[PDB]
Amino acid sequence: KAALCLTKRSRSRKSLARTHGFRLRMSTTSGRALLKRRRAKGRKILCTKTNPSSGKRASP
Amino acid sequence: QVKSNPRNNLISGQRRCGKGRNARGIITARHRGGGHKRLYRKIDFRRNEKDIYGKIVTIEYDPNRNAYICLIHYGDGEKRYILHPRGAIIGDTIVSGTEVPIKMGNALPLTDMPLGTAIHNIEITLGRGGQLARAAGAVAKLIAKEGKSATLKLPSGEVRLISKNCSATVGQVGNVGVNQKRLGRAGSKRWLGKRPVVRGVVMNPVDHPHGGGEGRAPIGRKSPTTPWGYPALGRRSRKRNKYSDNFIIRRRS
Amino acid sequence: SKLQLKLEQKMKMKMAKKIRLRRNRLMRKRKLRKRGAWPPSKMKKLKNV
Amino acid sequence: KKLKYPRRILDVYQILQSPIITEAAIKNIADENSLLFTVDVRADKKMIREAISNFFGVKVRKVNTLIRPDGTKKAYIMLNKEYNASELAKKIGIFP
RNA sequence: GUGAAACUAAGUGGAGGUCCGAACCGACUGAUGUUGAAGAAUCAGCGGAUGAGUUGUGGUUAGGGGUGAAAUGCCACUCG
RNA sequence: CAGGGCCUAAGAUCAGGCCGAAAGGCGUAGUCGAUGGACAACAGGUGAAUAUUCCUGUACUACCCCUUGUUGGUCCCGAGGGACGGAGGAGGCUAGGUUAGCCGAAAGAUGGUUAUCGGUUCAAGGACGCAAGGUGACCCUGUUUUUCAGGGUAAGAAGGGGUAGAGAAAAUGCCUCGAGCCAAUGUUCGAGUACCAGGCGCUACGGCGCUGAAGUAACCGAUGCCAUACUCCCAGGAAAAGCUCGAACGACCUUCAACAAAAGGGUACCUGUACCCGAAACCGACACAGGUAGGUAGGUAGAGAAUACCUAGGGGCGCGA
RNA sequence: GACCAGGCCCGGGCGACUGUUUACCAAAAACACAGGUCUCCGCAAAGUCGUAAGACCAUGUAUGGGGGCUGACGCCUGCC
Ligand SMILES: [Mg+2]
Ligand SMILES: [Mg+2]
Ligand SMILES: [Mg+2]
Ligand SMILES: [Mg+2]
Ligand SMILES: [Mg+2]
Ligand SMILES: [Mg+2]
Ligand SMILES: [Mg+2]
Ligand SMILES: [Mg+2]
Ligand SMILES: [Mg+2]
Ligand SMILES: [Mg+2]
Ligand SMILES: [Mg+2]
Ligand SMILES: [Mg+2]
Ligand SMILES: [Mg+2]
Ligand SMILES: [Mg+2]
Ligand SMILES: [Mg+2]
Ligand SMILES: [Mg+2]
Ligand SMILES: [Mg+2]
Ligand SMILES: [Mg+2]
Ligand SMILES: [Mg+2]
Ligand SMILES: [Mg+2]
Ligand SMILES: [Mg+2]
Ligand SMILES: [Mg+2]
Ligand SMILES: [Mg+2]
Ligand SMILES: [Mg+2]
Ligand SMILES: [Mg+2]
Ligand SMILES: [Mg+2]
Ligand SMILES: [Mg+2]
Ligand SMILES: [Mg+2]
Ligand SMILES: [Mg+2]
Ligand SMILES: [Mg+2]
Ligand SMILES: [Mg+2]
Ligand SMILES: [Mg+2]
Ligand SMILES: [Mg+2]
Ligand SMILES: [Mg+2]
Ligand SMILES: [Mg+2]
Ligand SMILES: [Mg+2]
Ligand SMILES: [Mg+2]
Ligand SMILES: [Mg+2]
Ligand SMILES: [Mg+2]
Ligand SMILES: [Mg+2]
Ligand SMILES: [Mg+2]
Ligand SMILES: [Mg+2]
Ligand SMILES: [Mg+2]
Ligand SMILES: [Mg+2]
Ligand SMILES: [Mg+2]
Ligand SMILES: [Mg+2]
Ligand SMILES: [Mg+2]
Ligand SMILES: [Mg+2]
Ligand SMILES: [Mg+2]
Ligand SMILES: [Mg+2]
Ligand SMILES: [Mg+2]
Ligand SMILES: [Mg+2]
Ligand SMILES: [Mg+2]
Ligand SMILES: [Mg+2]
Ligand SMILES: [Mg+2]
Numbered sequence A: 001k002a003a004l005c006l007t008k009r010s011r012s013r014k015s016l017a018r019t020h021g022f023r024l025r026m027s028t029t030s031g032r033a034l035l036k037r038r039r040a041k042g043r044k045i046l047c048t049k050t051n052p053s054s055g056k057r058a059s060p
Numbered sequence B: 001q002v003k004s005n006p007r008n009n010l011i012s013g014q015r016r017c018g019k020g021r022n023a024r025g026i027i028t029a030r031h032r033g034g035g036h037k038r039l040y041r042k043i044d045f046r047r048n049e050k051d052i053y054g055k056i057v058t059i060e061y062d063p064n065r066n067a068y069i070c071l072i073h074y075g076d077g078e079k080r081y082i083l084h085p086r087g088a089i090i091g092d093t094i095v096s097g098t099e100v101p102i103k104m105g106n107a108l109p110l111t112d113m114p115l116g117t118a119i120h121n122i123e124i125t126l127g128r129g130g131q132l133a134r135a136a137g138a139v140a141k142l143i144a145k146e147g148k149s150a151t152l153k154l155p156s157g158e159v160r161l162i163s164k165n166c167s168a169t170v171g172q173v174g175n176v177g178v179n180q181k182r183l184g185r186a187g188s189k190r191w192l193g194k195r196p197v198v199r200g201v202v203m204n205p206v207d208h209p210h211g212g213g214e215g216r217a218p219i220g221r222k223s224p225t226t227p228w229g230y231p232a233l234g235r236r237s238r239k240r241n242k243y244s245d246n247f248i249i250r251r252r253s
Numbered sequence C: 001s002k003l004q005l006k007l008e009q010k011m012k013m014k015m016a017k018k019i020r021l022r023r024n025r026l027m028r029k030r031k032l033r034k035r036g037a038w039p040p041s042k043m044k045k046l047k048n049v
Numbered sequence D: 001k002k003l004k005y006p007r008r009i010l011d012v013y014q015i016l017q018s019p020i021i022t023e024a025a026i027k028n029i030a031d032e033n034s035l036l037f038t039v040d041v042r043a044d045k046k047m048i049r050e051a052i053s054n055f056f057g058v059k060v061r062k063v064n065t066l067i068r069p070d071g072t073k074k075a076y077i078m079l080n081k082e083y084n085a086s087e088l089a090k091k092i093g094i095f096p
Numbered sequence E: 001g002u003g004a005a006a007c008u009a010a011g012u013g014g015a016g017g018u019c020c021g022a023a024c025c026g027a028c029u030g031a032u033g034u035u036g037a038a039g040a041a042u043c044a045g046c047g048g049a050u051g052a053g054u055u056g057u058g059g060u061u062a063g064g065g066g067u068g069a070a071a072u073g074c075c076a077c078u079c080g
Numbered sequence F: 001c002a003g004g005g006c007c008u009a010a011g012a013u014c015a016g017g018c019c020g021a022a023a024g025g026c027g028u029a030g031u032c033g034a035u036g037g038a039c040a041a042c043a044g045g046u047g048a049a050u051a052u053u054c055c056u057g058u059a060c061u062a063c064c065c066c067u068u069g070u071u072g073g074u075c076c077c078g079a080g081g082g083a084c085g086g087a088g089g090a091g092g093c094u095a096g097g098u099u100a101g102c103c104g105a106a107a108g109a110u111g112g113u114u115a116u117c118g119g120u121u122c123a124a125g126g127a128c129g130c131a132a133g134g135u136g137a138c139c140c141u142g143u144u145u146u147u148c149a150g151g152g153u154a155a156g157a158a159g160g161g162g163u164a165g166a167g168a169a170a171a172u173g174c175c176u177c178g179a180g181c182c183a184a185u186g187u188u189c190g191a192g193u194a195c196c197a198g199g200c201g202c203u204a205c206g207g208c209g210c211u212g213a214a215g216u217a218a219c220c221g222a223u224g225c226c227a228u229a230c231u232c233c234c235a236g237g238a239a240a241a242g243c244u245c246g247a248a249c250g251a252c253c254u255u256c257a258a259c260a261a262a263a264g265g266g267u268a269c270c271u272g273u274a275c276c277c278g279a280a281a282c283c284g285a286c287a288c289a290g291g292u293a294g295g296u297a298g299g300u301a302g303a304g305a306a307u308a309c310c311u312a313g314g315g316g317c318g319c320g321a
Numbered sequence G: 001g002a003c004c005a006g007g008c009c010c011g012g013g014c015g016a017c018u019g020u021u022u023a024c025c026a027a028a029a030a031c032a033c034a035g036g037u038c039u040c041c042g043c044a045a046a047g048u049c050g051u052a053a054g055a056c057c058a059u060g061u062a063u064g065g066g067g068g069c070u071g072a073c074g075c076c077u078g079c080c
């Protein structure tokens, strides 16, 4: 019943960083190539989706 | 006939979960999925515990096979499940061993079975556990025995040699009228976790060898075909030289 | 000799039923906390809703 | 059994950073006999209780921590009923 | 009712991919809208509504692929 | 209180192991992983912005401390338990509501009238307790079988004890003891100098200080509770820990050391906590006629959570004339 | 007496039926279905996925598992 454009919904930050998070890029080889690549371009943030396990941004 | 007991230690929840998905997670065996949660009953197919006197306490439903299953006790207090033989009634006594009476539910090697008997739950391999004739109403006659080898006629009609030292059980497998059921509606299939099947002729040419012709397709294929490109009808798939071949005599008709 | 067994078994029964019942309100309180109208005060501001 | 390891390894002399003096805290002192101390984020309650119990020599009832949105731990230290708050208020230089 | 059984009112019972209809899921007709209030909506009606139902959270399957009650449909407004 | 210091599901990673140009793929123990198991707190008050968190009352878990009582305890292991569907209706109850009764105030410029307006509230928890409820085998006689009445049978229910087999507990078999049992709710404490209609006084005319009457009964009645209680059905309805029990095997620890108990005192880990959340704060590029799980469920009519008009509470749609 | 709140009857085609479908121009006579029938497969099964190891099928065993056509029930299914 929701419009096509709604692809990004409200999803638990926990779930996202279990997908695009830091500790996941570190697992695969291709991810490590990712991080070398981003460091080369020199981005301020390596992993956009990430998340404190506990803290102010924590998802329980 | 069917009355639910509490749970004996024989009933667990551990199992494969995705039905028909392999390691890669791909659907391999098609059409499964959906359907009621089930628990695994640990059957005793081996019946390997010898020379103690077992007693049928109850008869119970099993979701996993279409036969019935019996809770049996012993004097030792161990409890097993066995496949329910046909005509067996609560209070009955069964036993396995070498020198044993021949009656319903008793289990013995093929050395000791009088020829012409009707058997179920048949090991092809010593101590591997019983394999052949485990479904409802399934039964196999022991026709002849010679040398180290005994001959059976399997419920498919196929006549085949096995080892004379492999255990088996007398009596045909119970719950014979199960295929006399008529499901009556779609839902009734879905309850069994069998999903709907699409006919080949219907799908697009990319999806399947009988692909969309204009209106309705006769199969122009010079032959009826698998989803994967092999002749659908009467092409024998048995591995040509498979080790079993010396054993197999007449083929099911 | 029967009065001993009866008073012992009623001591036991009083105990087990004490613990049981205690356990039961505890669970009820939990289910309510989960569902989320718990603290009876909460429920009494909203009775008229 | 063994030596008791403190939750982290800190240096106690840096954990209590300072009293927080605003209109808010002072009446918390008045009512509740409770001091207000900005402390190191990495610092816990057991460490704050030992620290202040030894430092000003007062027995402390209870400690309540907090973390600002700015990531600076803030601790309410409510002392016993015996030792008055305003005592330590004049001892420290916090004037109610 | 006959010796067995069949046959027939009665009560009890509460089956059903039963019926009517909100929530909820849909999307049949019309009107409006078309530099929209909105990159698919509002309005009045309309279909299912104990099931082959709806949904939440957490997962799986990935492009010579996946998934498909099969429309070349869907796979982040992108899919021969 | 919600997650973590507890346990596992789908799933993930995976020591060794198997395979593979490389990167890697499969896979066992292990370890992760809640949306589930386990586990202890409520009422009132304060309050520019927090409150089951701060204050006052009564509570409850887990440790430590003493007294007493025993001598082996701890883990590994063996077990019982935890532990489970759908549908259906009938009970027995509360939550709410309505009307009485009690108490206080009332004159609201009209033809009449007090028929009017307000109040009648209290939690977790602890002690008690359970029938017209529900369950407790059969046989004879009647009440429609039922709720019942007399007799009898000898385990015939929760619940306990014993024995036997390689056999501690368990399972299993034989013997025995028990007519009660179940649990919502209820009575009493908690609980009154709490709360509160009004009354008195101040007005920075915002709010404030002061004293406080009555505080019961009947009838409606849940979709909530007992309750995994029944009855029926086929499609047959999670695991593991805490928990209860226990010999041999292994490991480790041992005397004022450890464990067992009823009192008494003491002691109290991290992280979230603001605000919005049928949204001008999330998702729709907008202060966008849209999407967004769950909880609570008042009145009159009504079969109803539909509809219409209202309470509590919130609003008058950020261009007008 | 407001709001709320079925128009119905007689015919025929197609499809038995509840369902599913082309998000955003098509909801149907299309798909599914219970049922039917043909063929493969004796368990180290056939089939599917992988270079392989192995995984699914299945902790199943021919009253079971693949695959092809048709499509409830009734009457049938001719010749080459
Ligand atoms: Mg971004
Ligand atoms: Mg179970
Ligand atoms: Mg069990
Ligand atoms: Mg994978
Ligand atoms: Mg079919
Ligand atoms: Mg089909
Ligand atoms: Mg087509
Ligand atoms: Mg495919
Ligand atoms: Mg092709
Ligand atoms: Mg074709
Ligand atoms: Mg044509
Ligand atoms: Mg309402
Ligand atoms: Mg404060
Ligand atoms: Mg530091
Ligand atoms: Mg905190
Ligand atoms: Mg009726
Ligand atoms: Mg229906
Ligand atoms: Mg009607
Ligand atoms: Mg349309
Ligand atoms: Mg509409
Ligand atoms: Mg409708
Ligand atoms: Mg209608
Ligand atoms: Mg209609
Ligand atoms: Mg309807
Ligand atoms: Mg039904
Ligand atoms: Mg679901
Ligand atoms: Mg969806
Ligand atoms: Mg689809
Ligand atoms: Mg994109
Ligand atoms: Mg798209
Ligand atoms: Mg397209
Ligand atoms: Mg697992
Ligand atoms: Mg791996
Ligand atoms: Mg390795
Ligand atoms: Mg593993
Ligand atoms: Mg965890
Ligand atoms: Mg949880
Ligand atoms: Mg808790
Ligand atoms: Mg916890
Ligand atoms: Mg607030
Ligand atoms: Mg409060
Ligand atoms: Mg407190
Ligand atoms: Mg009080
Ligand atoms: Mg305690
Ligand atoms: Mg255990
Ligand atoms: Mg459960
Ligand atoms: Mg009821
Ligand atoms: Mg009442
Ligand atoms: Mg009245
Ligand atoms: Mg009166
Ligand atoms: Mg007047
Ligand atoms: Mg009144
Ligand atoms: Mg009480
Ligand atoms: Mg007590
Ligand atoms: Mg009674």
Ligand SMILES: [Mg+2]
Binding pocket: F167
């Ligand atoms: Mg024993």
Ligand SMILES: [Mg+2]
Binding pocket: none
């Ligand atoms: Mg013994």
Ligand SMILES: [Mg+2]
Binding pocket: none
């Ligand atoms: Mg026993």
Ligand SMILES: [Mg+2]
Binding pocket: none
């Ligand atoms: Mg009544």
Ligand SMILES: [Mg+2]
Binding pocket: F223
């Ligand atoms: Mg309902």
Ligand SMILES: [Mg+2]
Binding pocket: none
């Ligand atoms: Mg509800």
Ligand SMILES: [Mg+2]
Binding pocket: none
């Ligand atoms: Mg049941």
Ligand SMILES: [Mg+2]
Binding pocket: none
């Ligand atoms: Mg030992």
Ligand SMILES: [Mg+2]
Binding pocket: none
């Ligand atoms: Mg002990």
Ligand SMILES: [Mg+2]
Binding pocket: F050, F273
């Ligand atoms: Mg708060």
Ligand SMILES: [Mg+2]
Binding pocket: none
């Ligand atoms: Mg808040």
Ligand SMILES: [Mg+2]
Binding pocket: F287, F318
């Ligand atoms: Mg606006």
Ligand SMILES: [Mg+2]
Binding pocket: F288
């Ligand atoms: Mg808006």
Ligand SMILES: [Mg+2]
Binding pocket: none
């Ligand atoms: Mg909105």
Ligand SMILES: [Mg+2]
Binding pocket: none
């Ligand atoms: Mg109403």
Ligand SMILES: [Mg+2]
Binding pocket: F302, G004
């Ligand atoms: Mg009406």
